[PDB]
């Protein structure tokens, strides 16, 4: 065989050899044409085919690569599939009216283009920067997002322009007032948005943050603190076999791609020999970061970072014991560059276990707590950190010893900033965080995609709302007015599922298997989503934000499963106006399809609303986001009780250590 | 002849001061048979403390508050002792209240019920022979409130259970009936017996020690390889008595019988400018209302802080089990009924822990070679207390961005009641094991903040995210994306009575309207970021809502006055909830000014618990958290002078290794 070796596991990411085999296949299919590679990634097996292979002795699913290419002089993109075993293109089509994810190469070209463009140079000079100082001009290359002057007819970026007095400066204290529009493929500026009110470059010092800058600003650094050292002298408790993790009865596959970053698959829990599925797949599937200044051209700040840049493409190499402290297992990521050659991000994913405080404790007051049992918790963390120009997103998938799974996010990095004139008011749409610096209001919203398989196939979802009894105070049914219950609304059709978090009921959502019954409680096994960082989408209905991110206007969206329903703002996000039946809008359809007791997909919108303050500048302290999926009625008792306690003494042990009798303590 | 004065006016009473106070009170009431219920610091007046600390003012008097009972007299007496003069300076009799139930008060009840003929008869009817009363247990609760007796007797209710062996966890085997006990007479006065009898479960106990687990599931997991934490050069915090200094914070760590940990006089040293933040912060009350309407379960709504005391209930933490790493402990001291000091060793744990990343940024232009990373450390001041079945693990956390957070972990055992073989537990509870009904309930807490944000004269506000009122396609909001934060400053008490609202992602600011941040133009603040804010589910006019007037709003802001600590009143057990006391008194008619003055901010937070079998027989920790974050307090990130874990500038990276981007 001329073909690449098969992977250890059908969900493993393409290897570097597979990537090059796929791009050689595609270049040969398009021989004589000038093409460049935008995406070369695993096309995961169909859900049915994977489960049949894994659990039913079924066929080996074909090993497939999905590609996206551009061709010089042709609009839009072509996409397709390569069958790796046969080195052949098996599906292909041209999409002339979309634009694809912006890769690191696509973006890294823009600053050159603007520094050399005569119209940009003229605007720099009008803004107070001499023409021979263009090396001091920088830009963060953004997708244009959407601009109704061009649609998808050209592939465009917008350059958010800044100035550095010295290369070691943090540029964000010195935005310029104007916004060049760049044709990515022609490498040319095609327009510059210039405000009606000109604001020249700030004359203030840069707002810097390295130690040499801090010594100048505040006089000295704090002395190094005494260390806190973490060691695991007998190694770790988890076991990896390729990308497959085993830890504390969990087993799952750790995948990775250019767009979602980490993808956790085939998640099960070994309940005393009974290996019980939980999720087929869980990942972040899209984001949107909509800014809240209505002034032109700031409507074009609403990056969909996952679909427009890629949480894999943006991911940082983590080594070593700075980002991830302790004893660490790393994974690398592999992509294609534009030439079709593999590229590697070393140490893209960090895996480790950490102390997580107490798992459970109880002591008996009767012998003054001599009867006591204490068990400490350990958590497993699978992490990446990606950089979207100014911001850093730190992602932590956390498994815990009560069977819960949590996603923790920490936001850090730098505020997006725009220039503020000397006498200009930033509010109500932003904050003056430093002289002449306006940090606009914004949200950070994420779409968690869960493909559940709670205790096996055939699942449903529900909203669970705490409610007082409807019977009044002083009735026979509620004499003292204290009765309350959980109202469970099972979603029958897609439209039923379109629901928001509600503080008035402390709403949670269940994902459950209606085919099974817990023998104690009589309720179906479930994982419960406990999530309260669930902002409303503030942009209004019919806005460009709401149209491009149809998923973001509800906290929960549940649709039928179909293969290839990954990305809820569509497969090719940049420059889509938000008009059309694609992504989540397609999957919702008329709202009528069944989602009760079937294969479903559960997409959860969560995140934060950010009103900047000076504490966030020039570099932002981490701000946390979290959500939890908790087993409820899944087990018949606390699943962690077979973990050896940290301390345990029974009543009979404590007695030995020292009419009817009362309490020992009486 | 007086006790030594303490190092600091807010230090808790020493054992010597406790005994000096109870000797003074016994001499004042000479010839009378009295018992001690509470003997605790009466903290200095806020004005007197601040004057002493900051203005060279008078040393405040060192005072003890006491509560006593007298044999044959109703209610309590309470008063103050001036320690320097060994004299009672204030005293009064309150004949129609009942006070906190101490460990001694509660320790007695199981003896009483085991020996009571009517209880023995009910045990026999329930399937337990009369000569097996040593296998009958009860958790002694306050009666909470029962309209048959008011405050006219001091009462407990006994939640009764059965153990087949003393090492069992009893909660799989509740009995069906509820004795009512006169605490001071040590007698059963009544037994609530259900119309439907349910005899004791015949199932095995639902046990959780390793010997039980080996029998149940065959084997324990092997010991996991260790994770070891060491600080070979010591810790970065410094204590001087109860005064903590860490990462520019300075504060006093106090403790009492009722609130447990009390953090006082909290400041941040902003590059030599020592800026107040809070005068006092603590948990001031709780309520844990159950949601079964059936009699007598309406009496399960413990106000654990006011009825038992988070100090009285607190565990000795000794252990590198409860608190892992390099730990500083504090002891707690109280009085017993005889007036002798008692000690709980290792009541408070103090330590620092890694807390992940503080901040990071890298420049894509040189593929992240330009990078700065700084790791975070947190300071944790913790206690764990046991309220019979439940464990409450409390963690006050200071962080290096200037934020303060309170983290709680709930663990221990569900309250359980018996369920008949054919009885449905829902909708008010869950069958978590055969014949075991775990009723629905909430756990609610009242955080009390006495702020001094950047000094004296503070206000509070609700902050609501809102879309612009201008429509999509208007000149003012062409693309429909505009949004802002609507700040509603509370002018009078009534304005402050507000709930968390998911629809606006509501936060609350506590701010100083006399000052202005020179960059943003906004007042310095600490913002309460808190979303675990349940509605009170019990109806208006219910026992629960009347006894916990603070619990029906997420936020209550009132004027400061001295001695406004406890929002369900000073003597909680057996109060019906009728009357103008506690938070109801402090709210008054709602009209008093709370803008730019001395205020108190009481925040209700917690969870609503629908039990599931995972919670049984022993519950995995369930988290609750809230944060108070500086916003417009500093002019830049305050942590930037912490040494990075890693830093490389662009010029350094170039050395190590018009033009475009380096990576182009
Ligand atoms: Co932000
Ligand atoms: Co509970």
In A88-237, beta strands by DSSP E: 88-95, 137-143, 156-163, 179-183, 188-193, 229-231
Resolution in angstroms for this experimental structure? 1.3
Which residue in this structure is represented by tokens 């000690």? B343
Where in chain B is CATH 2.70.98.20?
217-655
Centroid of ligand 2 to alpha carbon of B611 (angstroms): 7
The per-residue DSSP string of A10-37 comes to: TTSPPPHHHHHHHHHHHHHHTTTS-EEE
Number of CB atoms found within 10 A of residue B655's CB: 9
Residues of B in contact with A638 (CB under 8 A): 208, 614-620
Question: Residue B226 to residues A350, A381, A583: CA-CA distances in angstroms?
Answer: 20, 17, 47
> What is Dmax (Cα atoms) for chain A?
102
Q: Please give the distance of CA B37 from its chain centroid, rounded to a whole number.
A: 21
From the list B513, B462, B464, B514, the residue with the least C-alpha distance to B490 is B462
CATH topology of domain A218-656: Beta-galactosidase; Chain A, domain 5 (2.70.98)
Residues of chain A with CATH 3.10.450.40: 1-103, 108-217
Rounded Cα–Cα distance for residues A626 and B624 (Å) = 12
Measured between alpha carbons, how far is A37 from A27 in angstroms, rounded to an integer? 10
Neighbours of B167 (CB within 10 A): 17
Q: If you write DSSP's letter for every residue of B473-499 in order, what string do you get?
A: TBTTBTTS--EEEEEEE--BHHHH-B-
Cβ pair A59, A53 in contact under 8 A: yes
Tokens 């596991």 correspond to A9
Residues in chain A: 666
Mutate to test the interface with B, among A136, A220, A521, A553 (most CBs of B within 10 A): A521
Burial of B434 (0-12, 13-18, 19+ CB in 10 A): middle
Strands (E), A148-212: 156-163, 179-183, 188-193
Q: What angle do CA A596, A598, A603 make, to 5 degrees?
A: 80
* Contact yes or no for B64/B39 (Cβ under 8 A): yes
Phi, psi dihedrals of residue A202, rounded to the nearest 5°: -60, 140
> Is there a contact between B220 and A642 if contact means CB atoms under 8 Å apart?
yes
Q: Does residue A159 contact residue A139 with C-beta atoms inside 8 Å?
A: yes
B475 contacts chain A (CB < 8 A): no
Residue positions counted in chain B? 664
Q: Is B329 a catalytic residue?
A: no
The answer, yes or no, to whether the previous bond of B296 is cis (omega within 30 of 0) is yes
In the 3-class helix/strand/coil scheme, how is A335-393 assigned residue by residue? EECCCCCEEEEEEEEEEEEEEEEEEEEEECHHHCCCCEEEEEEEEEEEEEEEEECCEEE
Cα(A24)–Cα(A201) distance, rounded to whole angstroms? 49
Element spanning B471, H or E: none
Do B480 and A523 make contact, defined as CB atoms within 8 angstroms? no
Task: Tell me if chain B has a CB within 8 Å of the CB of A432.
Answer: yes
In whole angstroms, what separates CA B525 from the centre of its chain? Answer: 24
- Which residue from A minimizes the CA distance to B167? A651
How far is it between the farthest Cα atoms of chain B? 99
Q: Give φ, ψ of B415 to 5 degrees.
A: -65, 130
CB contact (8 A) between residue B472 and residue A543: yes
CB neighbours of B104 closer than 8 A, spacing ≥ 6?
B336, B337
The separation between the first and the last C-alpha atoms of chain A, rounded to the nearest angstrom, is 82
Q: Which of B49, B145, B390, B500 is catalytic?
A: B390
Which residues of chain A make contact with B391, given a CB cutoff of 8 A?
A: 361-363
Class of domain B107-216: alpha beta
Chain B nearest-CA residue for A536: B503
The CATH homologous superfamily of the domain defined by B217-655 = Copper amine oxidase, catalytic domain (2.70.98.20)
Q: Start-end ranges of CATH 3.10.450.40 in chain B?
A: 1-103, 107-216
- Multiple choice CATH, B1-103, 3.90.25.10, 3.40.50.1360, 3.10.450.40, 3.30.360.10: 3.10.450.40
> CA-CA distance, A171 to B399, in Å (whole number)?
28
Q: Nearest bound ligand to CA A445?
A: 1
CATH 2.70.98.20 residue ranges in chain A?
Answer: 218-656
Counting Cα atoms < 13 Å in the Cβ hemisphere of A171 gives: 22
- Per DSSP, B171 falls in state G
- Find the catalytic residue in B82, B168, B304, B366: B304
The approach used to solve this structure was X-ray
E strands, A574-619, in order: 600-610
Question: Under 8 Å CB-to-CB from A78, ≥6 apart: which residues?
Answer: A30, A35, A68, A69, A70, A71, A92, A93, A94, A95
Catalytic residue among A305, A364, A457, A510: A305
* A354 neighbourhood in chain B, CB within 8 Å: 227
Kindly write down the DSSP assignment for every residue of A608-630, as one continuous string.
Answer: EEE---GGGSSSEEEEEEEEEEE
Q: Which residue has tokens 């309460």?
A: B528
Residue B317 phi, psi dihedral angles, 5° rounding: -95, -15
What does the DSSP assignment read for A213-235?
HHHHHHSSPPPPPPP-EEE-TT-
Name the nearest CA neighbour of B512 among B638, B599, B402: B599
Cβ(B568)–Cβ(B285) under 8 Å? yes
Q: Are A310 and A100 in contact (CB under 8 A)?
A: no
Breaks (C-N over 2.5 A) in chain B follow: 657
CATH domain A108-217 topology:
Nuclear Transport Factor 2; Chain: A, (3.10.450)
Q: State the DSSP H helix or E strand holding residue B451, giving kind and residue range, or none if neither.
A: strand B441-451
Say if residue B386 is preceded by a cis peptide, omega within 30 of 0: no
d(CA A645, CA A42) in angstroms, rounded, equals 43
Pick the residue from chain A with its C-alpha nearest to B635.
Answer: A614
Tokens encoding B280: 């006092």
């Amino acid at each position: 065989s001329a073909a690449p070796a098969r992977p250890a596991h059908p969900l493993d990411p393409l290897s570097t050899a597979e990537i090059k085999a796929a791009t050689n296949t595609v270049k040969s299919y398009f021989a004589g044409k000038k093409i460049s590679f935008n995406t070369v990634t695993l096309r995961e097996p169909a859900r049915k085919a994977y489960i049949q292979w894994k659990e039913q002795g079924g066929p080996l699913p074909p090993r497939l690569a999905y590609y996206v290419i551009l061709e010089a002089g042709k609009p839009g993109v072509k996409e397709g599939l390569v069958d790796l075993a046969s080195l052949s293109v098996i599906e292909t089509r041209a999409l002339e009216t979309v634009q694809p994810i912006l890769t690191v190469e696509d973006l890294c070209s823009t600053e050159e283009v603007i520094r050399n463009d005569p119209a940009v140079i003229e605007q720099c000079v009008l803004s107070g920067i001499p023409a021979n100082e263009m090396h001091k001009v920088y830009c963060d290359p953004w997708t244009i997002g959407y601009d109704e002057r061009w649609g998808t007819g050209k592939r465009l970026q917008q350059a958010l322009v800044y100035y550095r007095s010295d290369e070691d400066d943090s540029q964000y204290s010195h935005p310029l007032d104007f916004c060049p529009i760049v044709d990515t493929e022609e490498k040319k500026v095609i327009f510059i948005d210039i405000p009606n009110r000109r604001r020249k470059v700030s004359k203030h010092k840069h707002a810097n943050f390295y130690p040499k800058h801090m010594i100048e600003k505040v006089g000295a650094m704090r002395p190094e603190a005494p260390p806190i050292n973490v060691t695991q002298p007998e190694g770790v408790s988890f076991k990896m076999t390729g990308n497959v993790m085993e830890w504390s009865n969990f087993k799952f596959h750790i995948g990775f791609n250019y767009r979602e970053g980490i993808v956790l698959s085939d998640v099960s829990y070994n309940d005393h020999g009974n290996v019980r599925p939980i999720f087929h797949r869980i990942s972040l599937s899209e984001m949107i970061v909509p800014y809240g200044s209505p002034e032109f051209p700031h409507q074009r700040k609403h990056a969909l970072d996952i679909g427009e840049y890629g949480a894999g493409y943006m991911t940082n190499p983590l080594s070593l014991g700075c980002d991830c402290k302790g004893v660490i297992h790393y994974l690398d990521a592999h992509f294609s560059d534009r030439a079709g050659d593999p590229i590697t991000v070393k140490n893209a994913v960090c895996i480790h276990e950490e102390d997580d405080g107490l798992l459970f404790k109880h002591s008996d007051f009767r012998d003054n707590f001599a009867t006591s049992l204490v068990t400490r918790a350990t958590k497993l963390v699978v992490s990446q950190i990606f950089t979207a120009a100014n911001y850093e997103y730190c992602l932590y998938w956390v498994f815990m010893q009560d069977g819960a799974i949590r996603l923790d996010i920490r936001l850090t990095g730098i505020l997006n900033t725009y220039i503020l004139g000397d006498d200009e008011e930033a509010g109500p749409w932003g904050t003056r965080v430093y002289p002449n610096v306006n940090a606009h209001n914004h949200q950070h919203l994420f779409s968690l995609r869960i493909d559940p398989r709670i205790d096996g196939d055939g699942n449903s979802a529900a909203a669970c709302d705490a409610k007082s009894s409807p019977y009044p105070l002083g009735s026979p049914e509620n004499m003292y007015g204290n009765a309350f219950y959980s109202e469970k609304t099972t979603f029958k059709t897609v439209k039923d599922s379109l629901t928001n978090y509600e503080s008035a009921t402390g709403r949670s959502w269940d994902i459950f298997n209606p085919n099974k019954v817990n023998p104690y409680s009589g309720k179906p096994p479930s994982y419960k989503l406990v999530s309260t960082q669930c902002p409303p989408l503030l942009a209004k209905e019919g806005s460009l934000v709401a149209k491009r991110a149809p998923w973001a206007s509800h906290s929960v969206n549940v649709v039928p499963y179909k293969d290839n329903r990954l990305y809820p703002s569509g497969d090719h996000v940049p420059q889509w106006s938000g008009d059309g039946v694609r992504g989540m809008r397609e999957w919702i359809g008329d709202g009528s399809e069944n989602i009760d007791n079937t294969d479903i997909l559960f997409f959860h919108t969560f995140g934060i609303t950010h009103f900047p303050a000076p504490e966030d500048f020039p570099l932002m302290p981490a701000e946390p986001i979290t959500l939890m999926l908790r087993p409820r009625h899944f087990f018949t008792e606390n699943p962690g009780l077979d973990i050896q306690p940290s301390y345990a003494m029974t009543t009979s042990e404590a007695k030995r250590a020292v009419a009817f009798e009362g309490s020992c303590c009486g």
